[PDB]
Amino acid sequence: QVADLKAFSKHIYNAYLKNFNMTKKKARSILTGKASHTAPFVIHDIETLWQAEKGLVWKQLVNGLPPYKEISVHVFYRCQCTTVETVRELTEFAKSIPSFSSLFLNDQVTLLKYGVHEAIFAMLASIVNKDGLLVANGSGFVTREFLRSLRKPFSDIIEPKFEFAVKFNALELDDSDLALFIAAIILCGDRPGLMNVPRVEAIQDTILRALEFHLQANHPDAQYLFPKLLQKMADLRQLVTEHAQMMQRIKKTETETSLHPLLQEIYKDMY
Amino acid sequence: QVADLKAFSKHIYNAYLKNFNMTKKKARSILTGKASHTAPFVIHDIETLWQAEKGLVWKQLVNGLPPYKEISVHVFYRCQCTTVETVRELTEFAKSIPSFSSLFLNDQVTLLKYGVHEAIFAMLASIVNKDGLLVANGSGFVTREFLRSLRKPFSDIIEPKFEFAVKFNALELDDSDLALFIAAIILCGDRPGLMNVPRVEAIQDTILRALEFHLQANHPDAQYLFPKLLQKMADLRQLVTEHAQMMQRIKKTETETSLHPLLQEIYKDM
Ligand SMILES: CC/C=C\C/C=C\C/C=C\C/C=C\C/C=C\CCCC(=O)O
Ligand SMILES: CC/C=C\C/C=C\C/C=C\C/C=C\C/C=C\CCCC(=O)O
């Protein structure tokens, strides 16, 4: 409808504002180039990465790439630590969504388990750039070249994402739309082992209808509006599948590196 | 021909559906409970009014308030803007009535001139509620409480309209009834300066005749509806009289506020 479908798209927008510290616009700010309000320390190589591990600080001792842990793996650990944290915000974010907490715990776990990476890779575009990614809560900025200059096993696990972030930022969405887009991916009725599918499917529908109208009063000048955004959701589904594939293999050949137990829980039923 | 009269009535009903941007049906559906609700943006204070102007919006008239135009006057401005727009629709409505378009334009104008406000108040009831009314295609809803909190002048030209609307809605009329009713108040033979009254009187007769026959096959189980509507017309003729007197007062007293050129024309000899 209107107000009800207005106070719905807004409640999910505030939930999105108080659960995610870095917002697309708060981040599109830094990457800008005219506003020196925040000049992100660029990396691009081992040296600056080493100092950054001080000038940007990080709870893991000054760097640390011993014979048991190398550079590329350190980026990996860095990356999975962030992911584990984004999973936390996504959990709190969803718990704020209208009929989400209504579902039984097990069903909430099933939705997060299968949608947290899709939402993550979507938010990733908000802090990304054609030439790099914004890290360390806006304070830092690692170049895309550096990441491509990583070992053979890893490296090609972050590239495909940039490809996504690029195209996805062409649509020019803002945090208000993004909030509705994320709620929609988390509340997906196609997740395996879901118990009350009819319920989820129903909550998803209004999310999408809310998104639908919201794009009408926000982006009146294209056609991507919904179909293209619905196709991205499908694109994202594949990005994750491919992502999960690379994760298992890494775990199978990179015995050296450790995988966080939570990401292991998420990965073990995705084929 | 008692028959083939329900046809002339359906044509009038088509003229009503094609020309008015808001019908009672679409209106009564907005003020619904919750089942497939809509819930219009509410305006009940200066804040929400400001939020409306920016959100629900309208267009031009967003003039300040302390200077040569204030809050109450801003509502008055939006009031006459909705009034000038309803007049345009009423003109098209009438022109979609062959019998009406037969007459000479000068006569047509005299009819639109002395009947447009009466029709505007009958219809007002369709978008009105016991507590407020819809605005901007039903997108908004202004409370009755707010309106009555305006400066004494503007506030009391609004109240009487509600008193009328509430009692009018008790009759429970649908759009097809209103079409006949509104056509009746416009093709009225007693209008000042009417040139060919015998012609008008006759079209009025047919409309009221079709009106009574339509109320036959739409409101079977019902009291003295037909004549009850004839007294409403009389009541409408009086409400417009006191409205014109109140408009008179604002023209002499609220010199700072401006009136639309078309509306001054309707009140010139009125
Ligand atoms: C508040 C931060 C919000 C949104 C930004 C989203 C994501 C940043 C985190 C990771 C992105 C970097 C690389 C992605 C590629 C591989 C990581 C796999 C992580 C994992 O083990 O689950
Ligand atoms: C939207 C038009 C369709 C259906 C309803 C019909 C008419 C209601 C329109 C305007 C009435 C609103 C406020 C009237 C109160 C004061 C202004 C009187 C102005 C005047 O004398 O011409």
UniProtKB/Swiss-Prot annotation, chain A:
Keyword check for Ubl conjugation: yes
Transmembrane segments: none
Expression sites (tissue/organ): Ubiquitous with maximal levels in placenta and skeletal muscle.
Occurrences of domain NR LBD (ranges): 41-269
Keywords assigned by UniProt, alphabetized: Activator, DNA-binding, Metal-binding, Nucleus, Receptor, Transcription, Transcription regulation, Ubl conjugation, Zinc, Zinc-finger
Listed GO MF terms: DNA binding; DNA-binding transcription factor activity; DNA-binding transcription factor activity, RNA polymerase II-specific; DNA-binding transcription repressor activity, RNA polymerase II-specific; linoleic acid binding; lipid binding; NF-kappaB binding; nuclear receptor activity
GO BP annotations listed: adipose tissue development; apoptotic process; apoptotic signaling pathway; axon ensheathment; cell differentiation; cell population proliferation; cell-substrate adhesion; cellular response to hypoxia
GO cellular component, one term: chromatin
Post-translational note: 'Lys-48'-linked polyubiquitinated; leading to proteasomal degradation. Deubiquitinated and stabilized by OTUD3.
UniProt-annotated location(s): Nucleus
Chief localisation class: nucleus
Family: Belongs to the nuclear hormone receptor family. NR1 subfamily.
Quaternary assembly: Heterodimer with the retinoid X receptor. Interacts (via domain NR LBD) with CRY1 and CRY2 in a ligand-dependent manner.
Record function comment: Ligand-activated transcription factor key mediator of energy metabolism in adipose tissues. Receptor that binds peroxisome proliferators such as hypolipidemic drugs and fatty acids. Has a preference for poly-unsaturated fatty acids, such as gamma-linoleic acid and eicosapentanoic acid. Once activated by a ligand, the receptor binds to promoter elements of target genes. Regulates the peroxisomal beta-oxidation pathway of fatty acids. Functions as transcription activator for the acyl-CoA oxidase gene. Decreases expression of NPC1L1 once activated by a ligand.
Name of the featured protein: Peroxisome proliferator-activated receptor delta
Lineage: Eukaryota, Metazoa, Chordata, Craniata, Vertebrata
